[PDB]
Design an enzyme around this catalytic site. Sequence first.
Site, PDB file in Angstrom:
ATOM      1  N   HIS A 108       0.435  -0.996   0.169  1.00 38.50           N
ATOM      2  CA  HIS A 108      -0.049  -0.178  -0.035  1.00 38.50           C
ATOM      3  C   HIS A 108       0.410   1.053  -0.137  1.00 38.50           C
ATOM      4  O   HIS A 108       0.663   2.078  -0.986  1.00 38.50           O
ATOM      5  CB  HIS A 108      -1.353  -0.223   0.977  1.00 38.50           C
ATOM      6  CG  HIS A 108      -1.376   1.425   1.486  1.00 38.50           C
ATOM      7  ND1 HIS A 108      -2.738   1.770   0.899  1.00 38.50           N
ATOM      8  CD2 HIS A 108      -1.398   2.581   2.080  1.00 38.50           C
ATOM      9  CE1 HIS A 108      -2.953   3.407   1.680  1.00 38.50           C
ATOM     10  NE2 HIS A 108      -2.385   2.955   2.141  1.00 38.50           N
ATOM     11  N   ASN A 137      -7.320   2.764  -2.043  1.00 41.19           N
ATOM     12  CA  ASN A 137      -6.757   4.504  -2.129  1.00 41.19           C
ATOM     13  C   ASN A 137      -4.686   3.760  -2.433  1.00 41.19           C
ATOM     14  O   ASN A 137      -3.514   4.030  -1.609  1.00 41.19           O
ATOM     15  CB  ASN A 137      -6.588   5.755  -1.396  1.00 41.19           C
ATOM     16  CG  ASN A 137      -5.657   6.525  -2.325  1.00 41.19           C
ATOM     17  OD1 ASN A 137      -5.306   6.660  -2.607  1.00 41.19           O
ATOM     18  ND2 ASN A 137      -6.966   7.518  -1.813  1.00 41.19           N
TER      19      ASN A 137
HETATM   20  C1  YUQ Z   1      -5.634   8.570   3.757  1.00 43.10           C
HETATM   21  C2  YUQ Z   1      -5.582   8.463   3.325  1.00 43.10           C
HETATM   22  C3  YUQ Z   1      -7.055   7.569   2.894  1.00 43.10           C
HETATM   23  C4  YUQ Z   1      -8.283   8.252   2.119  1.00 43.10           C
HETATM   24  C5  YUQ Z   1      -9.371   7.964   1.604  1.00 43.10           C
HETATM   25  C6  YUQ Z   1      -9.670   6.729   1.228  1.00 43.10           C
HETATM   26  C7  YUQ Z   1      -8.510   5.977   1.743  1.00 43.10           C
HETATM   27  C8  YUQ Z   1      -8.331   3.922   1.349  1.00 43.10           C
HETATM   28  C9  YUQ Z   1      -8.839   3.009   0.987  1.00 43.10           C
HETATM   29  C10 YUQ Z   1     -10.347   3.517   0.223  1.00 43.10           C
HETATM   30  C11 YUQ Z   1     -11.260   2.811  -0.185  1.00 43.10           C
HETATM   31  C12 YUQ Z   1     -11.621   1.090   0.605  1.00 43.10           C
HETATM   32  N1  YUQ Z   1     -12.039   0.253   0.482  1.00 43.10           N
HETATM   33  S1  YUQ Z   1     -11.849  -1.366  -0.990  1.00 43.10           S
HETATM   34  C13 YUQ Z   1     -10.192  -1.412  -0.510  1.00 43.10           C
HETATM   35  O1  YUQ Z   1     -11.694  -0.023  -2.422  1.00 43.10           O
HETATM   36  O2  YUQ Z   1     -12.745  -1.859  -1.697  1.00 43.10           O
HETATM   37  C14 YUQ Z   1     -10.754   1.184   1.529  1.00 43.10           C
HETATM   38  F1  YUQ Z   1     -10.339  -0.168   2.194  1.00 43.10           F
HETATM   39  C15 YUQ Z   1      -9.355   2.325   1.950  1.00 43.10           C
HETATM   40  C16 YUQ Z   1      -7.078   3.993   1.790  1.00 43.10           C
HETATM   41  C17 YUQ Z   1      -6.578   3.141   2.085  1.00 43.10           C
HETATM   42  O3  YUQ Z   1      -6.566   2.304   0.953  1.00 43.10           O
HETATM   43  O4  YUQ Z   1      -6.024   2.450   2.962  1.00 43.10           O
HETATM   44  N2  YUQ Z   1      -6.307   4.891   2.235  1.00 43.10           N
HETATM   45  C18 YUQ Z   1      -7.308   6.469   1.905  1.00 43.10           C
HETATM   46  N3  YUQ Z   1      -5.156   8.304   1.620  1.00 43.10           N
HETATM   47  C19 YUQ Z   1      -4.950   8.882   1.259  1.00 43.10           C
HETATM   48  C20 YUQ Z   1      -4.140   9.340   0.188  1.00 43.10           C
HETATM   49  C21 YUQ Z   1      -4.062  10.113  -1.689  1.00 43.10           C
HETATM   50  C22 YUQ Z   1      -2.458  10.573  -0.833  1.00 43.10           C
HETATM   51  C23 YUQ Z   1      -2.390  11.949  -1.280  1.00 43.10           C
HETATM   52  N4  YUQ Z   1      -1.860  12.538  -2.523  1.00 43.10           N
HETATM   53  C24 YUQ Z   1      -2.117  10.217   0.495  1.00 43.10           C
HETATM   54  O5  YUQ Z   1      -3.460   8.298   0.381  1.00 43.10           O
HETATM   55  C25 YUQ Z   1      -4.352   7.365   1.225  1.00 43.10           C
HETATM   56  O6  YUQ Z   1      -4.145   5.944   1.858  1.00 43.10           O
HETATM   57 ZN    ZN Z   2      -2.898   4.551   3.308  1.00 43.59          ZN
HETATM   58 ZN    ZN Z   3      -5.486   3.622   4.854  1.00 40.59          ZN
END
Ligand code: YUQ
Ligand code: ZN
Ligand code: ZN
Length: 232
Positions: free
Chosen positions: A150, A181
Amino acid sequence: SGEYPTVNEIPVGEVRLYQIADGVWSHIATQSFDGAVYPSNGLIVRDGDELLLIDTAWGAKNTAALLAEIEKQIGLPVTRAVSTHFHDDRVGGVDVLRAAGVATYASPSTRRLAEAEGNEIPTHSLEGLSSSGDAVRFGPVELFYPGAAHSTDNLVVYVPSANVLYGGCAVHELSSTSAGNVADADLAEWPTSVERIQKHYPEAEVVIPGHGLPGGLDLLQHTANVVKAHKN
Ligand SMILES: C[C@@H](c1cccc2c(-c3ccc(NS(C)(=O)=O)c(F)c3)c(C(=O)O)[nH]c12)N1C[C@]2(C[C@@H](CN)C2)OC1=O
Ligand SMILES: [Zn+2]
Ligand SMILES: [Zn+2]
């Protein structure tokens, strides 16, 4: 009422705890990001008459609410926290923790990434985790660096007393039909990193993803599958 707490079931700002095993809880909170609402998980592990926290509750006010919920439900002090990667759902709230007297920790990789990107920065560096396959003990848990997934810095946490594997955001829940994400992910290395987790923790009984419902070891293979499908 006993089921695992879910996104539409938790208003943003409230925190719920879920007993995973003796001396092991997850914490669940909800947060808005880019106009959508998401749940996220962390872990709480009893450490004698103290508690070890894994990950913030995604935000300052959520993390203050987490501390209050811990006091209400458990009533032992949180003395240390580990953040498992640099994103706001892991470190956002570290300033709250630090002002509540919690000693905050993360790998040097996580600290550098958090600093560079403007996220909150854990105080103490966790050495001994810089090569994939590395493991170190931290109170009642083992911290393990599986390789990039991730994020490049993501850590997983194992509770050996309970065979609980907290995968953090390197592991997805079974109902996931996407890879979450992936902005900072390494989709090519992620399956290899999951394979390392599978090899290192074959006795895991509960696997907790960074977001969504816990299950068993199937979450690991499922994660590799959804990541490969996203990449392909
Ligand atoms: C703060 C964090 C972030 C924010 C919003 C959503 C997520 C999700 C996420 C989305 C959908 C699902 N459900 S699903 C498997 O699709 O069905 C899930 F389980 C988790 C995750 C993750 O996947 O951990 N994390 C998120 N951020 C922000 C960011 C963008 C970068 C800045 N340009 C930093 O990246 C990141 O991870
Ligand atoms: Zn993350
Ligand atoms: Zn996360």
